[PDB]
Amino acid sequence: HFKDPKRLYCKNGGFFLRIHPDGRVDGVREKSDPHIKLQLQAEERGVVSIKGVSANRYLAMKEDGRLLASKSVTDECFFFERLESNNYNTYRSRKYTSWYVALKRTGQYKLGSKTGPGQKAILFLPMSAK
């Protein structure tokens, strides 16, 4: 069901996208973490906003390519959602149209400026929030 919250699993390292109460963004492997339960919502065809249920904040990508979670919705909080031929999802900034939401093998996010269409760091698999 599309309206149900989800966890976003990153193929790179197997980390779940996490949004902390104070707005920090990273990844973690513990499926039990309460800060990985996310709520996606379409703003227009193929474009979504990603909100951390616990932190009550919205994922966003800044001008320098850094990721953070905002209390209020801004134009840096919307991403083109695409189901790739490999069956994984990608999230591309509608503002900075060349950068992708991504995680590093370490578990720390990856600068949007360092992302590309063929990278393993931009591939996510939406999963149920149990």
Partner 1 sequence: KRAPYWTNTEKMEKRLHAVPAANTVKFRCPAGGNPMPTMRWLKNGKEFKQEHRIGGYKVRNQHWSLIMESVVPSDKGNYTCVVENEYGSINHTYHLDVVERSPHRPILQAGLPANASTVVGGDVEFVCKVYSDAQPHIQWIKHVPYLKVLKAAGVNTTDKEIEVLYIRNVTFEDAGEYTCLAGNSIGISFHSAWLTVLPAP
Question: Where on the chain is the footprint of partner 1 (CB under 8 A)?
Answer: 2-3, 9, 11, 13-14, 29, 31, 40-49, 58, 63-64, 73, 75, 80-83, 85-89, 92, 97-98, 105, 113, 116-118, 125-127
Exposed, middle or buried by CB within 10 Å (0-12, 13-18, 19+), for 52? buried
Nearest residue (CB) to partner 1, 25 versus 49? 49
Structure tokens at 9: 């699993």
Environment class of residue 75 by beta-carbon count within 10 Å: exposed (0-12), middle (13-18) or buried (19+)? exposed
12 is known to lie in a ligand binding site: yes
How far is the C-alpha of 96 from the C-alpha of 63, rounded, in Å? 7
Residue 98 Cβ, how far from partner 1 at the closest point, in Å?
7
Shortest distance in whole angstroms from residue 35 CB to partner 1: 17
Residue 92 or residue 110: which is nearer to partner 1 going by CB? Answer: 92
Report the alpha-carbon distance of residue 124 to residue 58 in Å, rounded.
Answer: 18
Q: 14 or 34, CB closer to partner 1?
A: 14
Tell the smallest beta-carbon distance from residue 24 to partner 1 (Å): 22
Nearer to partner 1, 34 or 98 (CB): 98
Are the C-beta atoms of residues 127 and 31 closer than 8 Å to each other? Answer: no
Show binding-site residues for heparin. 12
